[PDB]
Design a protein around this ligand. Structure first.
Ligand code: B4P
Ligand code: B4P
Ligand code: B4P
Ligand code: MG
Ligand code: MG
Ligand code: MG
Lengths: 425, 80, 425
């Protein structure tokens, strides 16, 4: 009876529904925004930057993970390029154990070279290349007090009221030492005053602004990489796994194809522990096919947005709220999660997408023209990506406060919608 | 007064701006913004507060200034 | 079964419905617009100016009460400031028992001082500071007939055809005396011609234009004040009660919180007779929680307006017609009333809000740029607030005429709506 059911289905989009306020005991700032996409992949904010070549490369993926989200390195480059991008994010936060140093024998020019080359403002000076023993430190404010000179750095450096800290001192204590002594550098020494590391004001400042950073169990920022369905994707996945990628995104325009299902299964059987995100699907039947094939997370998004290309060109699409809810309903029965990829235009759409069933939202166009987005080339400049993400999570926190949702699980399971007519807009 | 202010300039300041340990850093920043970078710390010297001191501070109170390490000169000290 | 009811609710806004005409026996001018918010708080028009810092201070609250409505002094100032604003409205209409007078000893300059200082056009002249006995009156039209002079006011004042009235004469008789004798001042004297008061043309003119003024039982204009949920709100309420505030508005963005419920209850237990307006809520469950907590009137408004911030930022909202009706349905079961706060844009929306269940509508943006609105600063000038309120109540009167509603109770209980599709707009 397929001829009769041809027009029996109804579809709700973001603009069709509003979230109903309920009794609340939680302020927006006390809301838990963490989400467990799988046992090995956990975010602190449910935001993922899309695997698009105008959205996510290493700079975006690092920024996203610093804020608690996740970045998916796009697949529109060769396999070597993509393994290097994943590796660049995994090695970003190295904690500097190897500090760049110098000796009183060198000239002041030597010090400017180091500062100007690496955008560094301080050089710790050790007694010899071998018994690295801290004798002094030289900095730009020191250079300001000298007319260009090659005098020995020893008569130029700071030596009398030299301030160090031991290896293992906390970042808080490091901050207070910098704040009291009115200095911005804090070399780390051992028992015998061997130079062992360096802590700077801006290392502490970046911990203050990114305390929810999402990291693997070894303290490295999480990152994902995009995979299609081609001949060399098994080689692409292999190099990405060798770069310690945290999750592979089998990314296709129509994931409910047998060629996609086979690609999911043979990656799963090759790497049983790997995290697999597979999309794009928009029905429960397709969600069940991807999970049965071996996918951990199902990405939802066929034709979202009122007048996107999929709808105008092919006539195909599923209103995103209905897509999220139907796919989430199927994914619950298997204990799997859902990523909502598509037409989020305001922060309120994030609250709607997550209520409805989505465990995380994927964003691209909203982050496409940001500072950490690839290239300096036709997208308007939207500033640092953390400005956009801050307001997006700010709205989500506000919505969960209205809904009395202390965590995302309560928003997904319990939040109620009210259907609108659209009449005033 | 305007004429006298020009004639006395380029001498390399007998009447500088001043504060006391009772004031708050908010008083200093606004006195600075109205383009001086240092404010020596009543009617009858205890400290000095500058712009870089403000980076490690949060208007608080001005008594947490540069008070112990005070480098002062005699009146008549040459520019050299 | 919260997962299945996630999208079961429907919501109507103002643009979804029109009021159906019924058999009418009442003209718009004969419609009774009074409303009883509680036993101690009664309005002559169901219009309240919002407790917003761009809408209602003492000037707005006085104007609103003069027309039969109510003004809610906003909470964005300190406690002392807010008690002074409430007191300023309570002392506005003092009835002048203490008239500013002078004696023939003074110079004509003395009289100009008084007139120019207080925007006064007349000074009654008494024989001595003690036996205040009326001898004369001096006015600007008198000053016009003199080149600047310090001559004794006695050779300048009006004495031969001096017109007075007794204490206790009506305002009508005062008017006719002014109209016959072609004068604009009417001093009030006692049996022995002691000066006891003054009646002016513009005192009578303001009674003609504001005969529906809403007042407490002691003849003072009613006023309300806004309270949040902070540490010092109990001190704020106390000072406001000490300023003879008529109603406290516990004003929050999400009133269905336990911190709000507790604030309502401990104010109620502290002041058992005080009038409490608590909002903002948009469901019957929240209306029941506020009433049970001890609120007299429930304010309804979460996300009204098509593209307001609550909807765009948080994704939260309830279409206002549905919100009003569901909250009014609950409030009836407890014998309490409802205030409709939100997206009224035309006078016809007032008629819709009140039919549906609202006992009064709260307006802010429509009154934000009026003359009595705070400040001379980014809002377009909309003129005297009485121009806006006149057309708003004019539309409501027209709608009740179409509905055959002789009073607001008949509009609330009996008026029928017809649901529209929106198709032509
Ligand atoms: N060797 C290295 N290897 C690897 N990464 C490195 C590195 N050196 C720096 N980095 C990295 O580069 C960045 C550090 O520079 P930034 O953190 O970016 O620079 P800044 O502190 O904002 O510079 P500023 O110009 O304000 O400081 P100032 O000269 O006044 O300087 C501070 C003032 O305090 C004084 N001072 C500093 N330390 C002192 C000490 N121990 N004792 C006494 N005085 C000290 C100075 O004389 C000066 O007056 C970080 O990313 C850091 O990790
Ligand atoms: N009170 C006043 N009355 C009248 N005219 C005034 C005035 N103050 C300034 N002016 C006028 O303002 C003009 C502008 O010159 P400045 O405002 O001096 O500008 P600058 O030389 O470029 O200083 P900068 O901004 O780099 O200082 P910073 O805090 O980085 O670096 C300063 C550093 O010095 C240190 N410091 C200063 N005194 C110290 C002391 N006694 N002991 C220890 N450290 C001290 C601080 O800790 C800080 O690290 C002057 O020419 C003068 O005519
Ligand atoms: N002492 C006081 N204490 C407190 N509040 C006070 C006050 N005096 C005034 N106010 C207040 O200030 C306002 C009164 O002034 P407004 O009411 O605002 O002024 P106006 O009457 O419109 O002034 P106009 O300029 O047209 O009148 P004219 O000089 O022609 O004047 C009327 C004309 O009639 C004549 N006239 C008036 N009274 C007369 C009398 N009893 N006998 C004979 N001639 C009289 C005059 O000579 C003149 O020609 C009200 O708010 C009032 O409550
Ligand atoms: Mg510096
Ligand atoms: Mg400087
Ligand atoms: Mg006149």
């Amino acid at each position: 009876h397929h001829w009769e059911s041809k027009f029996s289905k109804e579809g709700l989009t973001f603009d069709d529904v509003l979230l109903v306020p309920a009794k609340s005991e939680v302020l927006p700032r006390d809301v838990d925004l963490s989400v467990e996409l799988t046992k090995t992949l956990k975010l602190n904010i449910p935001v993922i930057s899309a695997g698009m070549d105008t959205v996510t490369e290493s700079a975006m993926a690092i920024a996203m993970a610093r804020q608690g989200g996740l970045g998916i390195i796009h697949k529109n480059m060769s396999i070597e390029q993509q393994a290097e991008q994943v590796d660049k994010v995994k090695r970003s936060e190295r904690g500097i154990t190897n500090p760049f140093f110098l000796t009183p024998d060198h000239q002041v020019f030597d010090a400017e070279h180091l500062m100007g080359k690496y955008r560094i403002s301080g050089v710790p000076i050790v007694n010899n290349e071998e018994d690295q023993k801290l004798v002094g430190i030289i900095t730009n404010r020191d250079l300001r007090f000298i007319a260009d000179y090659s005098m020995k750095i020893s008569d130029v450096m700071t030596k009398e009221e030299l301030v160090t800290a031991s290896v293992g001192t906390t970042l808080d204590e490091a901050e207070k030492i910098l704040q009291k002594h009115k200095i911005e550098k804090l070399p780390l020494v051992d028992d015998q005053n061997k130079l062992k590391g360096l802590i700077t004001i801006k290392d502490i400042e970046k911990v203050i602004e990114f305390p929810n950073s999402s990291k693997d169990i070894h303290g490295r920022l999480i990152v994902g990489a995009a995979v299609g369905v081609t001949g060399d994707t098994m080689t692409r996945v292999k190099k990405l796994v060798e770069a310690n990628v945290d999750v592979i995104v089998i990314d296709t325009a129509h994931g409910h194809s047998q060629g996609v299902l086979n690609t999911v299964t043979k990656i799963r059987e090759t790497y049983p522990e790997l995290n697999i995100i597979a999309g794009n699907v928009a029905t429960a039947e397709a969600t069940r096919a991807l999970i049965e094939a071996g996918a951990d997370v199902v990405k939802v998004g066929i034709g979202p947005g009122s007048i996107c290309t999929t709808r105008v060109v092919a006539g195909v699409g599923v209103p995103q709220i209905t897509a999220i809810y139907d796919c989430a309903t199927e994914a619950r029965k298997h204990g799997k999660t859902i990523i909502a990829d598509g037409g989020i235009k305001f922060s309120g759409d994030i609250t709607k997408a997550l209520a409805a069933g989505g465990h995380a939202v994927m964003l691209g166009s909203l982050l496409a023209g940001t500072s950490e987005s690839p290239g300096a080339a036709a997208a308007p400049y939207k500033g640092p990506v953390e400005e956009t993400v801050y307001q997006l999570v700010g709205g989500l926190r506000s919505g969960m406060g209205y809904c009395g949702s202390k965590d995302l699980r309560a928003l997904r399971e319990e939040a109620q919608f009210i259907r609108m007519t659209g009449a005033a807009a | 007064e305007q004429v006298d202010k020009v004639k006395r300039s380029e001498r390399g300041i007998t009447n500088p701006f001043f504060l006391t340990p009772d004031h708050q850093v908010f008083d200093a920043e606004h006195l600075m913004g109205k383009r001086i970078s240092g404010v020596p710390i009543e009617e009858d010297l205890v400290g000095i507060i500058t712009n870089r001191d403000l980076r490690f501070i949060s208007m608080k109170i001005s008594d947490v200034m540069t008070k112990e390490e005070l480098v002062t000169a005699s009146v008549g000290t040459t520019l050299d």
